[PDB]
Amino acid sequence: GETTDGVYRVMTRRLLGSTQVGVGVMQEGVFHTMWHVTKGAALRSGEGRLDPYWGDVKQDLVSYCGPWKLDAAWDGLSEVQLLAVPPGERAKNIQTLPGIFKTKDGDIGAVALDYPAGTSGSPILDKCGRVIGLYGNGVVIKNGSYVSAITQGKRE
Amino acid sequence: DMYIERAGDITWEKDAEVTGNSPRLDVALDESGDFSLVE
Numbered sequence: 001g002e003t004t005d006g007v008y009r010v011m012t013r014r015l016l017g018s019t020q021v022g023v024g025v026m027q028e029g030v031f032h033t034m035w036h037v038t039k040g041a042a043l044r045s046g047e048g049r050l051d052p053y054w055g056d057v058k059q060d061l062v063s064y065c066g067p068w069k070l071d072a073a074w075d076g077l078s079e080v081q082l083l084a085v086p087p088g089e090r091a092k093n094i095q096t097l098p099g100i101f102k103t104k105d106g107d108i109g110a111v112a113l114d115y116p117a118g119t120s121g122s123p124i125l126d127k128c129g130r131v132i133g134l135y136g137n138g139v140v141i142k143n144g145s146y147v148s149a150i151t152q153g154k155r156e
Numbered sequence: 157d158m159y160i161e162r163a164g165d166i167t168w169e170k171d172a173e174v175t176g177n178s179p180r181l182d183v184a185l186d187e188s189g190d191f192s193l194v195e
């Protein structure tokens with residue numbers, strides 16, 4: 001099937017009509033998405049099949065066809081772009097300055113942008129267009145808004 | 157059964173809509189991969 005680099009929608013014909021369950025990044029022949037989007041199940045790309053290769057529920061990440069390729073990281077200082085791909089809507093770049101998730105194991109960047117659950121897996125970019133993480137795993141703050149972590153995997 | 161559809165190139169767009177605040181939150185991450193606000 002299609003192995004061209006770029007952002008993709010993860011769809012399902014298991015519910016009413018075609019439903020967008022998430023988003024993913026195709027890079028170096030490897031599809032990268034969030035674990036809660038596919039639950040580790042196989043994906044289809046036209047005629048071809050994509051089989052899971054690596055996955056981890058705690059990191060909430062999964063890769064298809066090969067090991068995790070995305071290794072860029074937020075510099076802690078500059079603005080980033082969320083290439084948001086919302087259900088039924090065109091891909092759209094939203095520039096923002098990330099905040100911080102302070103944890104017992106370290107600090108992680110966070111993007112405070114609200115989008116439908118089907119936007120999970122949309123990439124976060126640096127000024128060079130490098131994927132510094134995926135949007136879609138976060139929390140709801142006391143005012144009801146959504147703040148997502150900048151979730152990045154490890155490249156072996 | 158899930159399938160993928162291309163939605164675009166991964167490129168930085170100069171003059172994109174700048175929005176969103178940058179909050180500093182105390183969070184915890186559990187074994188199920190779910191975040192929670194620590195208070």
Ligand SMILES: Cc1ccc(S(=O)(=O)CNC(=O)[C@H](Nc2ccc3c(c2)CNC3)c2cc(Cl)cc3[nH]ncc23)cc1
Nearest residue numbers: 036060115116117119120136137138139140188189190
């Ligand atoms: C009723 C309820 C309770 C809690 C929340 S939350 O604040 O924790 C939002 N959680 C998400 O990050 C979620 N994705 C998700 C789903 C399952 C799992 C994982 C992550 C990782 N482990 C399993 C998501 C992402 C996005 Cl982009 C838009 C969204 N809207 N609602 C959800 C949600 C929201 C709602």
